[PDB]
């Protein structure tokens, strides 16, 4: 329970399925891109059967009429998603199914609604808006559906300012649904750190949910509840985005090519694929553990075959092996993928981490103070044996470590260190509110001390949100840097204390741990971070350039 996926499912099931569920009969469900991702997120597509769904189809693709079954339209308020519906009841007026049951993932504009109401049913026995416009990526991490948000959020200043406002409200209203699903009416507090986007957004959200609840028909929540929403801009921590993190999940999506949470084989023959989801429950116990601790907590070997191979429990060991043929089949996948990472590690990543941690901390490796840090960066130049990706990442740390660098010295690097093309992977970081040419700036923030224990002496770096999460739970947080019988009562449960965090421009898998580790160390409240997307070092760099060019 509580797992973000569950909460969403618990809502969809009672808001949608139960709402149009007739015990004796089943119906056809239609989904667009988003809703498909939404459902795939929090349920096996078989669980639907118990909910009154016998057939699911793509509302986009033309379909065969079934004028005997009722139709459940679970879609977003998208022009495309709605046009397709109107192509089932509106145009040609040639009805496709007995009746229609429309459930919009979010509020539906009058423009589209008008086109719906007018034409032409009748058949439309229901048009309901449930307000779920986010993806329960993990049981504590969410991600919105705001295409090309990052770009338009940190674009130079061309005609890409009208579309930036578009992305802003999209994020705002999309974030609001996150609250509404948790049944929380938080207090919006931004950061006064880089740029000022988080403040503008914090205003859109604060206003957005002031209108929401003022109209919410669920009637559960009205007036602020015991939870606070933090909106922070990406500039606040450029470091953690670039670090070659060592915790399993953050290192896999970084090193290996794991597009769409699906890591591809071998092994073996032929090459299949595996999915890194929470239904695995094995990868859930490992995705946040350090690479070494990972291996030494499930690997070699429970062998030779446990206590096999006088046999009183002979049949027991015969049946116990039949079902255990899957526990090993899964332990293998989460081991091969672990190998593919272990390799890239011993090959050069290991050496790359040595001088990265000492630079990101600038005083790590016991070397207090350090002084000349450009001496620390050197190693990663002849150890290449490297990719221009790792090279830029290392330099980025150096600059972040010495804040605003010089204009001339920076130039020499982009020359006598190759990195000719893809040079903007360093330049454009200034658009995110991080000094690139002007020395100093805000002279850096102030983070927590200890620095207690830190095995491996490589991942001694802690993302700045963890010091923010605790700075929120422990209450101690700068108010200037983080603005804003009878009786009656207004009961009551359940939700309780929740810390909702939302970083703009994406979150790292290393920052995701922070949510778990902090909420796991605590219990009096659950931290919940999110964004428009999840970040990987490379994908970030790619996105971080291209900024100075209006697409095209």
């Amino acid at each position: 329970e509580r797992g973000l996926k569950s909460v969403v499912w618990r809502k969809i099931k009672t808001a949608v399925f139960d709402d149009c569920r007739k015990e004796g009969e089943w119906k056809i469900m239609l989904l667009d891109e988003f809703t498909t991702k939404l459902l795939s997120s929090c349920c096996k597509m078989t669980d639907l059967l118990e909910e009154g769904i016998t057939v699911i189809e793509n509302i986009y693709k033309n379909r065969e009429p079934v004028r005997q079954m009722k139709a459940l339209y679970f879609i977003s308020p998208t022009p495309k998603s709605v046009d397709c519906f109107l192509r089932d009841f509106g145009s040609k007026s040639e009805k496709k199914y007995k009746a229609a049951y429309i459930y919009f993932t979010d509020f539906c504009p009058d423009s589209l609604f008008n086109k719906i109401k007018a034409s032409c049913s009748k058949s439309i026995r229901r048009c309901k808006e449930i307000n779920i416009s986010f993806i329960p990526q993990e049981s504590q991490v969410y991600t919105l559906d705001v295409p090309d948000a990052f770009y338009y959020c940190y674009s130079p200043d061309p005609s890409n300012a009208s579309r930036k406002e578009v992305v802003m409200e999209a994020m705002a209203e999309q974030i609001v649904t996150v609250c509404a699903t948790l049944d929380e009416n938080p207090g919006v507090r931004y950061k006064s750190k880089p740029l000022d986007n988080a403040s503008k957004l914090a205003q859109l959200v604060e206003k957005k949910l002031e209108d929401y609840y003022k109209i919410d028909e669920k009637g559960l929540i009205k007036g602020k509840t015991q939870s606070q929403l933090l909106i922070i801009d990406r500039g606040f921590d450029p470091v953690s985005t670039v670090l070659h993190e060592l915790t399993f999940q953050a290192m896999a999506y970084d090193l290996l090519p794991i597009e769409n949470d699906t890591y591809k084989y071998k092994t073996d023959g032929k090459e299949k694929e595996a999915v890194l989801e929470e239904d695995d429950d094995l990868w859930v116990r490992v995705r946040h553990r350090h690479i070494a601790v990972v291996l030494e907590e499930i690997p070699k070997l429970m062998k030779e075959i446990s206590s096999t191979k006088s046999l009183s429990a002979l049949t027991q060991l015969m049946k116990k092996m039949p079902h255990f043929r899957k526990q090993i089949s899964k332990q293998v996948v989460h081991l091969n993928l672990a190998e593919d990472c272990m390799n890239k590690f011993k090959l050069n990543i290991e050496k790359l981490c040595k001088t990265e941690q000492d630079l990101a901390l600038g005083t790590d490796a016991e070397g207090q103070r350090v002084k000349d840090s450009m001496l620390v960066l050197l190693p990663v130049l002849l150890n290449k044996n490297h990719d221009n990706c790792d090279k830029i990442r290392a330099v980025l740390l150096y600059i972040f470590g010495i804040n605003g660098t010089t204009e001339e010295n920076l130039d020499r690097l982009i020359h006598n260190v190759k990195i000719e093309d893809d040079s903007d992977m360093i330049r454009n970081w200034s658009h995110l509110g991080v000094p690139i040419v002007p020395p100093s700036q805000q002279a850096k923030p102030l983070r927590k001390d200890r620095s207690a224990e830190e095995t491996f002496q490589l991942s001694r770096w802690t993302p700045f949100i963890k010091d923010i999460m605790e700075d929120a739970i422990d209450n101690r947080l700068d108010s200037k840097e983080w603005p804003y019988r009878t009786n009656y009562l207004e009961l009551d449960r359940k939700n309780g204390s929740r810390l909702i965090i939302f970083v703009i421009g994406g979150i790292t898998y290393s920052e995701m741990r922070c949510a778990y580790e902090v909420s796991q160390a605590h219990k009096s409240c659950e931290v919940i971070i999110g964004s428009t997307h999840i970040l990987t070092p490379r994908k970030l760099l790619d996105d971080i350039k291209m900024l100075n060019k209006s697409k095209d």
């Binding site: 048009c127 808006e129 109209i215």
Partner: peptide, 9 residues
Amino acid sequence: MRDRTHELR
């Protein structure tokens, strides 16, 4: 609004 069914008719 959250339930527009009535609004259709």
